[PDB]
Design an enzyme around this catalytic site. Sequence first.
Site, PDB file in Angstrom:
ATOM      1  CG  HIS A 182      -1.712   1.249   1.391  1.00 62.47           C
ATOM      2  ND1 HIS A 182      -2.943   1.406   0.794  1.00 62.47           N
ATOM      3  CD2 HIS A 182      -1.459   2.409   2.038  1.00 62.47           C
ATOM      4  CE1 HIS A 182      -3.415   2.607   1.068  1.00 62.47           C
ATOM      5  NE2 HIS A 182      -2.533   3.236   1.822  1.00 62.47           N
ATOM      6  CD  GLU A 183       2.210   3.637   3.572  1.00 59.30           C
ATOM      7  OE1 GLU A 183       2.587   4.714   3.064  1.00 59.30           O
ATOM      8  OE2 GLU A 183       1.123   3.525   4.171  1.00 59.30           O
ATOM      9  CG  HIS A 200       0.902   6.295  -0.842  1.00 63.52           C
ATOM     10  ND1 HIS A 200      -0.208   6.872  -1.425  1.00 63.52           N
ATOM     11  CD2 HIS A 200       0.492   5.813   0.355  1.00 63.52           C
ATOM     12  CE1 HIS A 200      -1.242   6.751  -0.612  1.00 63.52           C
ATOM     13  NE2 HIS A 200      -0.843   6.112   0.473  1.00 63.52           N
ATOM     14  CD  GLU A 221      -4.904   7.119   1.647  1.00 63.04           C
ATOM     15  OE1 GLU A 221      -5.091   6.193   2.464  1.00 63.04           O
ATOM     16  OE2 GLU A 221      -3.769   7.481   1.269  1.00 63.04           O
ATOM     17  NE  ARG A 259      -9.335   0.482   6.701  1.00 66.20           N
ATOM     18  CZ  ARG A 259      -8.940   1.652   7.193  1.00 66.20           C
ATOM     19  NH1 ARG A 259      -7.756   2.153   6.850  1.00 66.20           N
ATOM     20  NH2 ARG A 259      -9.727   2.321   8.032  1.00 66.20           N
ATOM     21  CG  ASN A 302     -54.905  -7.941 -23.384  1.00 62.16           C
ATOM     22  OD1 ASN A 302     -54.412  -7.004 -24.011  1.00 62.16           O
ATOM     23  ND2 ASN A 302     -54.167  -8.882 -22.798  1.00 62.16           N
ATOM     24  CD  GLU A 349     -73.990 -35.236   9.662  1.00 66.92           C
ATOM     25  OE1 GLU A 349     -73.639 -35.272  10.862  1.00 66.92           O
ATOM     26  OE2 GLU A 349     -73.194 -35.402   8.712  1.00 66.92           O
ATOM     27  CD  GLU A 350     -78.609 -33.356   8.176  1.00 63.26           C
ATOM     28  OE1 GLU A 350     -79.005 -34.468   7.763  1.00 63.26           O
ATOM     29  OE2 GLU A 350     -77.495 -32.858   7.859  1.00 63.26           O
ATOM     30  CB  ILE A 363     -79.929 -23.787   4.127  1.00 62.67           C
ATOM     31  CG1 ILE A 363     -79.795 -22.314   4.486  1.00 62.67           C
ATOM     32  CG2 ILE A 363     -81.343 -24.075   3.640  1.00 62.67           C
ATOM     33  CD1 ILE A 363     -80.120 -21.393   3.326  1.00 62.67           C
ATOM     34  CG  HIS A 364     -80.693 -30.542   5.945  1.00 59.54           C
ATOM     35  ND1 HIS A 364     -79.505 -31.117   5.544  1.00 59.54           N
ATOM     36  CD2 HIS A 364     -81.619 -31.530   5.908  1.00 59.54           C
ATOM     37  CE1 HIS A 364     -79.704 -32.394   5.274  1.00 59.54           C
ATOM     38  NE2 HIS A 364     -80.978 -32.671   5.486  1.00 59.54           N
TER      39      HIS A 364
HETATM   40 ZN    ZN Z   1      -2.440   5.579   1.999  1.00 61.09          ZN
END
Ligand code: ZN
Length: 1287
Positions: A229-230, A233, A267, A369, A1021, A1185-1186, A1236-1237
Amino acid sequence: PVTINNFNYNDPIDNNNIIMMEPPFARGTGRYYKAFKITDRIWIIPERYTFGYKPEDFNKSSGIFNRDVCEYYDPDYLNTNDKKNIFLQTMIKLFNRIKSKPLGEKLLEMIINGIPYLGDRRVPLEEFNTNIASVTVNKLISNPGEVERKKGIFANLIIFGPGPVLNENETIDIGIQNHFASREGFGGIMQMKFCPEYVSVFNNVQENKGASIFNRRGYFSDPALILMHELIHVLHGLYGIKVDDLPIVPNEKKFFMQSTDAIQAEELYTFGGQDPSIITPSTDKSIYDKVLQNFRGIVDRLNKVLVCISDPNININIYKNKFKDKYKFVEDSEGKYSIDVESFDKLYKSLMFGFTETNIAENYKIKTRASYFSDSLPPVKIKNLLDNEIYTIEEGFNISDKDMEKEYRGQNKAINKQAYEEISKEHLAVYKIQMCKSVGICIDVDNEDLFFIADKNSFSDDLSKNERIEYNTQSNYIENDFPINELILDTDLISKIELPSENTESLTDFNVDVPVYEKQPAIKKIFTDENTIFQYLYSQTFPLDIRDISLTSSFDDALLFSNKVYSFFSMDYIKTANKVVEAGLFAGWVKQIVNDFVIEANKSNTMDKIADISLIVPYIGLALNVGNETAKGNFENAFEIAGASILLEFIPELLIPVVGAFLLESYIDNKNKIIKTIDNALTKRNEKWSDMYGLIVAQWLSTVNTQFYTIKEGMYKALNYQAQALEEIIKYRYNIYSEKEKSNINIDFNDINSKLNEGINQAIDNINNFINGCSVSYLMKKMIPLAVEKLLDFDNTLKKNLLNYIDENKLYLIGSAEYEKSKVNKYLKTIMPFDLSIYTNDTILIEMFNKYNSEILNNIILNLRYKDNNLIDLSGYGAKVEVYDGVELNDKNQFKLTSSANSKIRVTQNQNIIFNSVFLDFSVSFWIRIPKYKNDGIQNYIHNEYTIINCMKNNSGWKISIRGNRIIWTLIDINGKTKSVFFEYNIREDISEYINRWFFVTITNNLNNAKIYINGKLESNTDIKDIREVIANGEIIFKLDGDIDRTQFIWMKYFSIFNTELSQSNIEERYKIQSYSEYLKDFWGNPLMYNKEYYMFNAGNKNSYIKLKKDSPVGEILTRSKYNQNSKYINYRDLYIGEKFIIRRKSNSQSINDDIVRKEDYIYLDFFNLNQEWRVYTYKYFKKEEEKLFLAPISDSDEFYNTIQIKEYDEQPTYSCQLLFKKDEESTDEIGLIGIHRFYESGIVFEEYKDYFCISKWYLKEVKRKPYNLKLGCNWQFIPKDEGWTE
Ligand SMILES: [Zn+2]
Ligand SMILES: [Ca+2]
Ligand SMILES: [Ca+2]
């Protein structure tokens, strides 16, 4: 190939590869330093960097040199020969690790051959001058006893050990008479302060670093990447391109803002990745131009250089040849040097975008990073880089043979602990902001935790300047990228030209500028009584000397009592956590509160689909109180209303320049140049759009996304504090018991912590998605549209400008001045769509973008909703909405349009939203309730078409109108050509699903069709390929307009617009989401109410209704009467017929006023018999039944069930509901459902079948079948009188 020399600190001086150097900043006085030549032009001086620092500064003090670095001090570093030698051997290994790969070897090769030009700005063009401190450095030949003999040498790089702060590596260039040769094209001797063992620590918040809060989280750096990195530069400095330009500077007008040094574009280029995107294309080009200009100056010197006075021995040709190759200049067969644009361009991109920390880390499989703007952490000390068991030249820490290769485990602090040691905080210096309240309690905050927000000054205004469009003028673009593969395989990238000898005449002019550094207070106080994020996070901590705490939802007590800790989790969670139990119940409790924790954390996945918000973390406001008092009121609501912007701590003042006007060059009689000119201005216009967008992205990344990053971090800390607090309580409670009791208490702290940690990781992911979504939302709705405005304004100004031009030249344009008149319009027509990936190739950002754009809800450009007795647009685009007096609205989001002149709504749409896809592509959705026609006004009803919603601009647009039982969608292209598609419901049906009933509408438009959907299903359509442009962002008017009856009205709900075509799936899904409710509905589709008269309808027996039988306590079933009057158009069955029922609530004797009926409620089903109110019952002992339901007065016979439970078995939207009889509320014994029946009856006279109001068990199994049988005779609906239905 690059050769790395070898030697020991004690090897003897030979005045060649091991010398006694006089460093540049010593100004030719002071002592010399034993220097070692690690490679050509590169020297290593294993000693502390002292130039510009006081000797005591080397000790940790109350001050700090840099505000954003956890600075570590140690004046003993390198204080012995063995240490100096270790430093040497370590550097040798790093350089070896570096050239271990092609990419690194080239960086080294480029650097070795990038010899500084012999001279600087002050030197005459015809000369080479070696007698300046940026070119020559001296070595003492003399015997230790006198500085009798000194010799000069050329050098490219000198590397020292660290200055006062070990972990603050830095590359320095030489300034002379206030100018920097390394910044003006010449290049100059570069220096570096470097420390290999104390490396930086970083960690990715969006990722899980071991995914363990109770463990060390983070990754440590490969010192070789740090060095590379340096060295980047250094490379820039050597080639003289380390120029200065408009810097990114932090706003510091607010206490919550982070203070840091200005950041130069160089930078950010060095780091690479996303960072270059913070440098606007504007500045990108400014820098490109400055460098180019510097090169023009050098190439000119090469064509003028004649002599070198400083060193009579310098060979002019040898150097002219070297420099030609260095700068990639081209030489004609005559010897004339000139700049070749291709070569330059490629060389420039290679140095600024090819060699970046990001690209290198990627090539060497080293983790680093995420961005220059990433919170710094305390550094760690690597134990021994010289141990191949821990660090190798080939793989660094990520050694495969040790299984530390995958996921960069070798750099993982939680995984590779044998590799490093933690640092004594006692020696760390951290710049802090002390926030005091005017009274007074104080809180310290690391300058790192504050919000970094770029000041407006950070950005270029170049867009506001004029442009000269000429037949030759051309576009300007600088791609902040470079194909690393070609860079690595580039055959002629590395010089093949002889490196000259380093020996030259001694340096006598030691003139040079030496920097002077000094510490500044590490603590800066500020007074504020604000209780924002810093305070809220603080209130969640507790002193080390306190071990008994209690949680509290009171932020104020947490601050006041050290034993009180704030929690943003639920009241219940808080009570349980403070509970105290018997040793025998402790284990149960631990499991309970822990599970509870995960539950609370998991609420981070809350959905709010009804408000068109997929994800929302409800507790973010309570946890940090960030932005606009987000800890007060309901967060979810506040968010629905203002959105992402309420989370920001500060709203940035964006810089959106009025694009400079264009100036075209006229060319009389030249039909060619004139045209070129035009064409060019066009292209240039596009460049202006792109540049504007980049300017936006740059500000978004450094003023907005930065704040959101701070929030994500705040949430990670908040959650961590909560877990720690709970853990603290658990430990405290457990240790209260005796050893005897503890022995019998089954608890595993490792499982507890594992449970917590997991819950946190889930929450973090949810939180990260929510926040990235917000950030992108702010960009697209709060930033981009404002750029669009000025860009469209520019277009117009340019439009006439161009026309007025073609105008003036029509002469020399003869029979073509026309073919281009359109050419212009058709260009300035279709604008430029914003594309993030254009300004960055950062995987994370790109994905955030695609994710956002893949969420249909973000295509909502208008969403009218009710709020505090008013309709507002919550699309986030800020449409202006005027609701006039004649419009009625309710909190059910229903609004009514009447026949009155003032029953109207006016929507002024945002003009800066891309809506002109250039083929028509958008949808409109809404619910509606259209009243039944008046039986005596049926002719007008079917004859009078009336507009309800109109959106026109210049006789072009769309509209929704109605004609009786038909709703119509109409489009008008810029030519007046019309197209329609409609939906007509039948008005001759016994019972209609539409008349006077709420139903969902959705209209989609695309280059080919206009489709109308009803309740999720496609009904109509229309091919619209013919239709041309259609202006759709004009004003929208909601009002009945046509020859309507004075009693005519319309109800509307959830009106919204999407700038895209919704799929059948989206539509079906919106239908279901908007249909949902806790309460049941009535026949018309409105919520069901208690104490409200209703007639009963049966979905299985449409034309049947209930009536109390004259001589029996039963409900017989009769056929509904039908439309009596005559007319060939209508037919229906009466609805206001049969007994008038009324639903009564069961529990809470809070009177019988009114209220909403919710699914699962217990009720009484009554009706009116004359002046009395009867009730519906079931004989408890029927055996069949009902059974026929028993209808009689209100009483409490022990022989009859009277309690009913209202149900919803249908999982799809429906207005039907069902009624269940169960033994009692508790019991799970279902007696049956109401229906209803059919019965056969044979009396002495009549013989027939007759239906009755019954209860039946047969329905029980039937309601489980799928799909739900809507026709079941147990499906009911309640019909109340409604002005929309008359009979
Ligand atoms: Zn730097
Ligand atoms: Ca850039
Ligand atoms: Ca406290």
